[PDB]
Amino acid sequence: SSWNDLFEYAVYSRGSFLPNYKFTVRGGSIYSGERIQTQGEFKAIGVNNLICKGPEVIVNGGGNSIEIKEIMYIQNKLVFNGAPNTNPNTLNANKIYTGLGGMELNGYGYYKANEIYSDGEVQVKNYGNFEIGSIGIVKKLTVTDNGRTTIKSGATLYCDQLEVRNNGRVFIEAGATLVTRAISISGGTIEGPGTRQVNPSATFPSYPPFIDDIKNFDFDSRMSVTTLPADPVGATTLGSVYDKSATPWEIVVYGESGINDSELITEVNSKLGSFPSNVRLYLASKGNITFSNPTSLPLYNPTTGKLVIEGAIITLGSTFNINISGAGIELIYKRAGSTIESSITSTLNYIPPP
Ligand SMILES: [Ca+2]
């Protein structure tokens, strides 16, 4: 699997991506060209990459749990806004990069990165817990307001500046090392059996190459968005292409002005003569997606209270909202078969990089 392949994404958003409350993506990758803003209970389980090339990624509320297996690229700023101690956030990420806007890890949360690189200030505050498993290279690390940052054994943090304040704590484990060019501890602690080194002329290692690779990739250049097709069969706003040679059946639904659940029931049944609960669904829309009555879709699971979409969602508008009434989404990534890829490649005039 490749981070520059459109068909690797569970969510590919050309513009922004504002999911509904209670949204789980399981597998695949997540891309947005502009802002990502999640309004609570957002979960990424087994996500390979999360690439955001816009100005913010704002994770709001509690109960968020994000797992990144490879690269989390944050073009400018990432902000976990704050979780109740009764519904804390978790982040487990392999490699994280942020640009100049930083990474604000507000608290009631356990945030782990194995590698962290940042052209800005990593803040850990308001009881947040941040652990670096192997390496860190950041402009600034500041722990305040009862935060905690642990350098785990074997790891090395490099930061140009280190600020600890208002009962912030930095723990350096045995065999770990923190290396800063300047330091300012007023009100906070640094303990632990590892080495802490102040060196105004320290030489840091180089960023790994994936950072520039992604910064340098013009995602938009790979496609030419024109109009999304529509047929009068079924919902007159939507178009679709389907594949019954696959198991389960696969259908991609195109909606130039958005998609809703009434239209989806109409369109799918017209093409398939039914709407089996196991259908693999690929939604491609230039407006929002709205499920006003999700229990009407056979994808709704009454036991979990979730719409279970197996497939992927491609959104092409500048702004994009998923809205749903009285249910959560469980989007399980499933790579499309070739009939569906050919339809999407044709529709978006897509040229895969390799
Ligand atoms: Ca139609």
Short mmCIF file of C-alpha atoms and ligand atoms in Angstrom, two decimals:
data_model
loop_
_atom_site.label_atom_id
_atom_site.label_comp_id
_atom_site.label_asym_id
_atom_site.label_seq_id
_atom_site.Cartn_x
_atom_site.Cartn_y
_atom_site.Cartn_z
CA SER A 1 0.00 0.00 0.00
CA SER A 2 1.15 3.50 -0.98
CA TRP A 3 0.38 6.93 0.49
CA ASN A 4 0.22 8.54 -2.96
CA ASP A 5 -2.36 6.06 -4.34
CA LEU A 6 -5.92 7.38 -4.46
CA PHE A 7 -7.35 3.87 -4.09
CA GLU A 8 -5.59 3.39 -0.74
CA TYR A 9 -7.83 5.98 0.93
CA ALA A 10 -10.87 5.22 3.04
CA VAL A 11 -11.51 8.98 3.00
CA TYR A 12 -10.10 11.09 0.17
CA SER A 13 -11.23 14.71 0.51
CA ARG A 14 -10.09 17.19 -2.14
CA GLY A 15 -11.37 19.98 0.08
CA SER A 16 -12.12 19.79 3.79
CA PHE A 17 -13.39 16.76 5.76
CA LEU A 18 -15.79 17.37 8.65
CA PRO A 19 -17.13 14.01 9.83
CA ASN A 20 -20.12 13.53 12.05
CA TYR A 21 -20.05 12.77 15.74
CA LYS A 22 -19.30 9.05 16.18
CA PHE A 23 -17.26 8.25 13.08
CA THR A 24 -14.89 5.32 12.87
CA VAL A 25 -12.63 4.65 9.93
CA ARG A 26 -11.07 1.18 10.06
CA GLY A 27 -8.19 0.59 7.66
CA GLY A 28 -7.14 2.49 4.59
CA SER A 29 -5.84 6.02 4.68
CA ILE A 30 -7.27 9.49 5.15
CA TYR A 31 -6.46 12.53 3.02
CA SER A 32 -7.71 16.09 3.04
CA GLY A 33 -6.65 19.03 0.91
CA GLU A 34 -7.95 21.60 3.43
CA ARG A 35 -9.17 21.42 7.05
CA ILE A 36 -10.03 18.31 9.08
CA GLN A 37 -12.29 18.98 12.05
CA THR A 38 -13.85 16.18 14.08
CA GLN A 39 -16.68 16.87 16.53
CA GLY A 40 -16.24 14.05 19.03
CA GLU A 41 -16.04 10.25 19.18
CA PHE A 42 -13.77 10.16 16.14
CA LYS A 43 -11.83 6.90 15.77
CA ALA A 44 -9.22 5.73 13.28
CA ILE A 45 -8.48 2.03 13.85
CA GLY A 46 -5.64 0.59 11.79
CA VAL A 47 -5.35 3.65 9.51
CA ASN A 48 -2.16 3.54 7.45
CA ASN A 49 -1.73 7.23 6.65
CA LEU A 50 -3.49 10.48 7.58
CA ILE A 51 -2.25 13.25 5.26
CA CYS A 52 -3.61 16.77 5.69
CA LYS A 53 -2.33 19.38 3.27
CA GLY A 54 -4.52 22.22 4.61
CA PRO A 55 -4.04 24.64 7.51
CA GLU A 56 -5.56 22.79 10.53
CA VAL A 57 -6.47 19.39 11.89
CA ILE A 58 -8.74 20.07 14.84
CA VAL A 59 -9.83 17.10 16.95
CA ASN A 60 -12.59 18.24 19.33
CA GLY A 61 -14.39 16.56 22.23
CA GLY A 62 -13.54 13.29 23.92
CA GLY A 63 -13.57 9.60 23.14
CA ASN A 64 -11.27 10.05 20.17
CA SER A 65 -8.83 7.25 19.47
CA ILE A 66 -6.45 7.53 16.49
CA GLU A 67 -4.07 4.79 15.27
CA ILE A 68 -1.61 5.67 12.51
CA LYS A 69 0.51 2.78 11.26
CA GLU A 70 2.81 4.75 8.97
CA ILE A 71 2.77 8.52 8.33
CA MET A 72 0.63 11.26 9.84
CA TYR A 73 1.53 14.35 7.80
CA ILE A 74 0.23 17.63 9.20
CA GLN A 75 0.96 20.47 6.77
CA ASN A 76 0.56 23.25 9.36
CA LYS A 77 -1.09 22.60 12.77
CA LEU A 78 -2.66 19.71 14.73
CA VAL A 79 -4.79 20.37 17.80
CA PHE A 80 -6.39 17.95 20.23
CA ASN A 81 -8.67 20.44 21.90
CA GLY A 82 -9.49 18.62 25.13
CA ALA A 83 -11.09 15.51 26.55
CA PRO A 84 -12.95 14.92 29.82
CA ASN A 85 -11.09 12.60 32.18
CA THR A 86 -14.19 10.41 31.85
CA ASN A 87 -13.81 10.12 28.04
CA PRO A 88 -10.14 10.66 27.17
CA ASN A 89 -8.43 10.71 23.78
CA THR A 90 -5.77 8.28 22.65
CA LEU A 91 -3.27 8.63 19.81
CA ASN A 92 -0.89 5.83 18.75
CA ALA A 93 1.10 6.92 15.74
CA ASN A 94 4.23 5.63 14.09
CA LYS A 95 5.60 8.83 12.50
CA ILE A 96 4.12 12.31 12.97
CA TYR A 97 5.12 15.49 11.16
CA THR A 98 3.73 18.98 11.70
CA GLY A 99 4.67 22.28 10.09
CA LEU A 100 4.99 25.69 11.72
CA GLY A 101 1.62 25.58 13.51
CA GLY A 102 2.71 22.77 15.83
CA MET A 103 0.92 20.03 17.76
CA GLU A 104 -1.24 21.01 20.73
CA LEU A 105 -1.96 17.94 22.86
CA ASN A 106 -4.53 19.11 25.35
CA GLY A 107 -5.31 16.63 27.96
CA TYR A 108 -7.11 13.72 29.39
CA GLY A 109 -5.40 11.68 26.74
CA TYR A 110 -2.51 9.30 26.17
CA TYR A 111 -0.61 10.35 23.06
CA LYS A 112 2.15 8.12 21.70
CA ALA A 113 4.38 8.76 18.71
CA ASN A 114 7.41 6.68 17.83
CA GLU A 115 8.90 9.45 15.68
CA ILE A 116 7.81 13.10 15.89
CA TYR A 117 9.13 15.92 13.70
CA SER A 118 7.86 19.46 14.00
CA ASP A 119 8.80 22.82 12.52
CA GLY A 120 6.81 24.36 15.41
CA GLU A 121 5.94 23.99 19.10
CA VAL A 122 4.72 20.71 20.57
CA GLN A 123 2.52 21.68 23.50
CA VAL A 124 1.49 19.06 26.04
CA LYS A 125 -0.88 20.60 28.57
CA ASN A 126 -4.07 20.34 30.63
CA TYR A 127 -3.17 16.83 31.92
CA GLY A 128 -2.15 15.46 28.51
CA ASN A 129 0.29 12.54 28.36
CA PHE A 130 2.75 12.41 25.48
CA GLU A 131 5.35 9.64 24.99
CA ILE A 132 8.13 9.59 22.38
CA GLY A 133 9.10 6.00 21.62
CA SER A 134 12.19 6.42 19.47
CA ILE A 135 13.05 9.93 18.16
CA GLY A 136 11.92 13.54 18.22
CA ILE A 137 13.11 16.64 16.36
CA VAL A 138 10.98 19.71 17.12
CA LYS A 139 11.36 23.47 17.32
CA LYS A 140 9.97 23.65 20.85
CA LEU A 141 8.49 21.35 23.46
CA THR A 142 6.44 23.04 26.15
CA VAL A 143 4.75 21.17 28.99
CA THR A 144 2.35 23.25 31.09
CA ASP A 145 -0.78 23.02 33.19
CA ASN A 146 -0.15 19.47 34.46
CA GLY A 147 0.97 17.91 31.19
CA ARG A 148 3.56 15.14 31.00
CA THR A 149 6.04 14.20 28.29
CA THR A 150 8.03 10.97 28.66
CA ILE A 151 11.08 10.13 26.57
CA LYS A 152 10.98 6.34 26.62
CA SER A 153 14.05 4.13 26.95
CA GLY A 154 16.31 4.19 23.93
CA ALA A 155 14.67 7.33 22.51
CA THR A 156 16.23 10.74 21.87
CA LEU A 157 14.37 14.05 21.73
CA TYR A 158 16.01 17.06 20.08
CA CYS A 159 14.40 20.47 20.47
CA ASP A 160 15.77 23.95 19.88
CA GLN A 161 13.90 25.08 23.00
CA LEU A 162 12.44 23.34 26.03
CA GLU A 163 9.93 25.06 28.31
CA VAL A 164 8.34 23.44 31.39
CA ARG A 165 5.85 25.34 33.50
CA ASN A 166 2.84 25.27 35.84
CA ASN A 167 3.35 21.69 37.15
CA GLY A 168 4.35 20.29 33.78
CA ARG A 169 6.58 17.24 34.07
CA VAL A 170 9.18 15.80 31.71
CA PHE A 171 10.35 12.28 32.50
CA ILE A 172 13.47 10.90 30.80
CA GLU A 173 13.65 7.16 31.10
CA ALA A 174 16.81 5.15 31.61
CA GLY A 175 18.73 4.94 28.37
CA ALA A 176 16.79 7.90 26.93
CA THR A 177 18.20 11.37 26.18
CA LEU A 178 16.74 14.87 25.81
CA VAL A 179 18.89 17.39 23.90
CA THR A 180 17.87 21.07 23.92
CA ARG A 181 19.63 24.27 22.88
CA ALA A 182 17.85 26.39 25.52
CA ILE A 183 15.76 25.60 28.60
CA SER A 184 13.35 27.39 30.94
CA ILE A 185 11.93 25.55 33.96
CA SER A 186 9.72 27.73 36.18
CA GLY A 187 7.21 25.76 38.23
CA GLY A 188 7.79 22.38 36.60
CA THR A 189 9.87 19.28 37.04
CA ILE A 190 12.27 17.07 35.13
CA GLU A 191 13.03 13.76 36.83
CA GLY A 192 13.91 10.24 35.75
CA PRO A 193 17.20 8.37 35.35
CA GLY A 194 18.02 9.42 31.78
CA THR A 195 20.34 12.07 30.38
CA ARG A 196 19.22 15.69 29.89
CA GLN A 197 21.64 17.83 27.87
CA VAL A 198 21.72 21.61 27.22
CA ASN A 199 23.94 22.64 24.29
CA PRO A 200 23.26 25.98 22.54
CA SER A 201 25.20 24.79 19.46
CA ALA A 202 23.82 21.26 19.23
CA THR A 203 23.65 19.60 15.82
CA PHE A 204 20.38 17.74 15.20
CA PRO A 205 19.93 14.87 12.74
CA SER A 206 18.17 15.44 9.46
CA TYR A 207 14.45 14.99 8.88
CA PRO A 208 13.72 11.70 7.11
CA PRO A 209 12.84 11.96 3.41
CA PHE A 210 9.10 11.17 3.58
CA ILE A 211 8.45 14.71 4.80
CA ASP A 212 9.67 16.40 1.65
CA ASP A 213 8.16 13.67 -0.56
CA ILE A 214 4.69 14.48 0.75
CA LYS A 215 5.19 18.24 0.93
CA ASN A 216 6.29 18.02 -2.71
CA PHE A 217 3.41 15.87 -3.99
CA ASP A 218 0.68 17.85 -5.79
CA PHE A 219 -2.28 15.58 -5.03
CA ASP A 220 -4.65 17.75 -7.06
CA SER A 221 -2.45 17.45 -10.13
CA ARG A 222 -3.28 13.74 -10.42
CA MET A 223 -6.91 14.32 -11.47
CA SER A 224 -9.12 16.74 -13.40
CA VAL A 225 -12.50 17.23 -11.75
CA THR A 226 -15.26 18.13 -14.20
CA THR A 227 -18.85 16.96 -13.57
CA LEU A 228 -20.03 13.86 -11.85
CA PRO A 229 -22.29 11.67 -14.02
CA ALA A 230 -26.01 11.13 -13.45
CA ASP A 231 -28.52 8.71 -15.12
CA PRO A 232 -32.36 8.98 -15.00
CA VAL A 233 -32.47 5.34 -13.87
CA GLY A 234 -32.97 5.44 -10.14
CA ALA A 235 -32.36 8.72 -8.32
CA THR A 236 -32.23 11.40 -11.02
CA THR A 237 -29.48 13.32 -9.17
CA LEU A 238 -27.10 10.33 -8.90
CA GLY A 239 -25.17 8.18 -11.29
CA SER A 240 -23.55 4.85 -10.65
CA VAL A 241 -21.48 2.02 -12.07
CA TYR A 242 -21.70 -1.46 -10.53
CA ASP A 243 -19.93 -4.84 -10.65
CA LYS A 244 -21.77 -8.09 -9.92
CA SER A 245 -18.75 -10.24 -10.83
CA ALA A 246 -17.25 -9.31 -7.44
CA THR A 247 -18.30 -10.87 -4.15
CA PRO A 248 -19.86 -8.95 -2.46
CA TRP A 249 -21.31 -6.80 -5.22
CA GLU A 250 -19.59 -3.45 -5.65
CA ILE A 251 -21.21 -0.19 -6.72
CA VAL A 252 -19.84 3.33 -6.87
CA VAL A 253 -22.39 6.13 -6.52
CA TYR A 254 -21.66 9.54 -8.06
CA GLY A 255 -23.48 12.59 -6.72
CA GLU A 256 -22.69 15.96 -8.32
CA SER A 257 -24.81 17.84 -5.73
CA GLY A 258 -24.38 15.46 -2.78
CA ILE A 259 -25.87 12.12 -1.75
CA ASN A 260 -28.60 11.25 0.75
CA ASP A 261 -30.12 8.02 1.99
CA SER A 262 -33.40 8.32 0.08
CA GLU A 263 -31.51 8.81 -3.20
CA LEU A 264 -29.11 5.98 -2.33
CA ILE A 265 -31.92 3.45 -1.75
CA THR A 266 -33.50 4.50 -5.06
CA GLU A 267 -30.27 4.42 -7.08
CA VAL A 268 -28.82 1.18 -5.69
CA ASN A 269 -32.04 -0.84 -6.10
CA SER A 270 -32.51 0.37 -9.66
CA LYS A 271 -29.09 -0.91 -10.72
CA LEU A 272 -28.98 -4.13 -8.67
CA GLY A 273 -32.63 -5.19 -8.40
CA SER A 274 -32.02 -5.21 -4.62
CA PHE A 275 -29.84 -3.64 -1.92
CA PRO A 276 -28.10 -6.39 0.07
CA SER A 277 -26.63 -5.45 3.41
CA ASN A 278 -23.19 -6.76 2.33
CA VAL A 279 -22.84 -4.45 -0.71
CA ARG A 280 -19.48 -2.70 -1.03
CA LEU A 281 -20.21 1.01 -1.40
CA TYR A 282 -17.92 3.64 -2.94
CA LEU A 283 -19.41 7.13 -2.55
CA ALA A 284 -18.05 9.96 -4.69
CA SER A 285 -19.59 13.38 -4.15
CA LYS A 286 -19.03 17.06 -4.92
CA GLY A 287 -21.28 18.16 -2.09
CA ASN A 288 -22.10 16.83 1.35
CA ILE A 289 -23.43 13.42 2.31
CA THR A 290 -26.54 13.39 4.50
CA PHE A 291 -28.22 10.40 6.10
CA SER A 292 -31.47 11.90 7.42
CA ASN A 293 -33.02 8.55 8.32
CA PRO A 294 -30.13 6.05 8.42
CA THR A 295 -32.24 3.13 9.76
CA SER A 296 -33.82 3.05 6.27
CA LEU A 297 -30.47 1.85 4.81
CA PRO A 298 -29.71 -1.91 4.99
CA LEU A 299 -26.20 -0.87 6.02
CA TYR A 300 -27.61 0.14 9.42
CA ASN A 301 -26.75 -2.31 12.20
CA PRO A 302 -29.34 -2.05 15.00
CA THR A 303 -27.06 -3.88 17.45
CA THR A 304 -24.22 -1.34 17.16
CA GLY A 305 -26.42 1.62 16.19
CA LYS A 306 -24.09 2.32 13.26
CA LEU A 307 -24.29 2.64 9.51
CA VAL A 308 -21.62 0.18 8.33
CA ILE A 309 -20.18 1.31 4.98
CA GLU A 310 -17.59 -1.09 3.55
CA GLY A 311 -15.66 0.64 0.74
CA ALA A 312 -14.51 4.28 0.62
CA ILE A 313 -15.64 7.90 0.32
CA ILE A 314 -14.21 10.39 -2.18
CA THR A 315 -15.29 13.98 -1.74
CA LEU A 316 -14.50 16.69 -4.25
CA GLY A 317 -16.05 19.88 -2.95
CA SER A 318 -14.10 22.65 -1.27
CA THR A 319 -16.00 21.83 1.92
CA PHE A 320 -17.48 18.47 2.94
CA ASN A 321 -19.79 17.45 5.80
CA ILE A 322 -21.13 14.03 6.72
CA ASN A 323 -24.41 14.47 8.57
CA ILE A 324 -26.50 11.72 10.11
CA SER A 325 -29.38 11.61 12.59
CA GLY A 326 -29.34 9.17 15.49
CA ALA A 327 -26.52 6.81 14.45
CA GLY A 328 -22.77 6.54 14.03
CA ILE A 329 -20.77 5.60 10.93
CA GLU A 330 -18.39 2.66 10.88
CA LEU A 331 -16.51 3.07 7.58
CA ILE A 332 -14.47 -0.09 6.91
CA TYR A 333 -11.97 0.48 4.11
CA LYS A 334 -12.15 -2.07 1.29
CA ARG A 335 -10.04 -1.54 -1.83
CA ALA A 336 -12.20 -1.40 -4.95
CA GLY A 337 -12.11 -3.96 -7.74
CA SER A 338 -11.03 -2.95 -11.20
CA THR A 339 -14.46 -2.19 -12.70
CA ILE A 340 -14.96 0.32 -9.91
CA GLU A 341 -11.42 1.72 -10.20
CA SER A 342 -11.81 2.07 -13.97
CA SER A 343 -15.06 3.96 -13.40
CA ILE A 344 -13.44 6.33 -10.87
CA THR A 345 -10.23 6.74 -12.89
CA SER A 346 -12.33 7.61 -15.93
CA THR A 347 -14.69 9.93 -14.02
CA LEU A 348 -11.97 11.97 -12.27
CA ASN A 349 -9.46 11.73 -15.16
CA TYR A 350 -7.08 10.24 -12.64
CA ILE A 351 -3.44 9.38 -13.39
CA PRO A 352 -1.92 7.12 -10.71
CA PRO A 353 1.68 8.18 -9.91
CA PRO A 354 3.88 5.02 -9.59
CA CA B 1 -29.56 7.57 -11.56
#
